[PDB]
């Protein structure tokens, strides 16, 4: 997972 | 507003689990990059439970994290380092001695840097609190680093968190000059931190140019921001 990813998850 | 006891503590539950790493150049890079790419997948989920981080819009979640993840992964091993002169505590199973240093050109300016730092902490006997807050300050961009409501906000969080830094220090009952000195030295050594993390970025670049360590996934992503 990316950061964006992570931080919406 | 949180009363800062209540700041504090939350900080404390926030707190990311541990992870265990599993020499040469290459050998020591690869553990220390993938070290740091487990920790920083730890480290977001880690700044979500900061109070009002998410409340922030994305992009300045987003350039808070690129600016100072490096920083953040600093502390936490000057914080692990403390109590053991002369040793770098990077994981349980990856702990180095400074002249490990050797296996990894450029890497030893980096550890004693890293190793003085933290010999300043166990000099100031650096309070479990106090690195609760100077963490989550690094994060807020205590730094002020250039990244309207979302900027307000962050102010906001990082005024809490500052002033929670004042509470705890005020706890210890020494004079208010004396509490005044410590505030300052801590901020000071955050400043020197921010520059041991550009060094240590501009090293880590240098390493994956070089070919001497493949950089993937999200420590990459990190990296190519910097
Ligand atoms: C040693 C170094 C700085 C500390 C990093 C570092 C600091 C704190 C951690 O918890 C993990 C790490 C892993 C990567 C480490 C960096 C590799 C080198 O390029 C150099 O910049």
């Known amino acids: ?6 931080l919406a998850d | 507003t949180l009363s800062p006891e209540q700041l504090v503590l939350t900080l404390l539950e926030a707190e990311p689990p541990n992870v265990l790493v599993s020499f040469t150049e290459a050998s020591m890079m690869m553990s220390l990059t993938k070290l740091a790419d487990k920790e920083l997948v730890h480290m977001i989920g880690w700044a979500k439970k900061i109070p009002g981080f998410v409340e ?3 992009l300045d979640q987003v350039r808070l994290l690129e600016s ?4 953040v992964l600093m502390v936490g091993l000057m914080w692990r380092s403390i109590d053991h002169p002369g040793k770098l505590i990077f994981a349980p199973d990856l702990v ?4 490990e240093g050797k296996c990894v050109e450029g890497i030893l300016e980096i550890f004693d840097m890293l190793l003085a730092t933290t ?3 166990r000099e100031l006997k650096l309070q479990h609190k106090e690195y609760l807050c100077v963490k989550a300050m690094i994060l807020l961009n205590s730094s002020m680093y250039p990244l309207a409501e979302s900027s307000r906000k962050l102010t906001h969080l990082l005024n809490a968190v500052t002033d929670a830094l004042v509470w705890v220090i005020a706890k210890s009952g020494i004079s208010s ?3 005044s000195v410590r ?3 801590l901020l000071m050594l955050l400043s020197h931190v921010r520059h041991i993390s550009n060094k240590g970025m501009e090293h880590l670049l240098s390493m994956k140019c070089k070919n001497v ?4 996934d999200l420590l990459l992503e990190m990296l190519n921001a910097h």
């Open chain 2, 119 to 121: 010999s300043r902490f």
């Open chain 2, 177 to 179: 000059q004396q509490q």
């Open chain 2, 96 to 99: 180095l001695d400074r002249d």
């Open chain 1, 1 to 6: 997972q990316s950061l964006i990813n992570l």
């Open chain 2, 68 to 71: 100072c993840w490096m920083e």
């Open chain 2, 213 to 216: 360590v493949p950089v993937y």
């Open chain 2, 56 to 58: 922030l819009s994305l």
């Open chain 2, 183 to 185: 505030l300052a030295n």
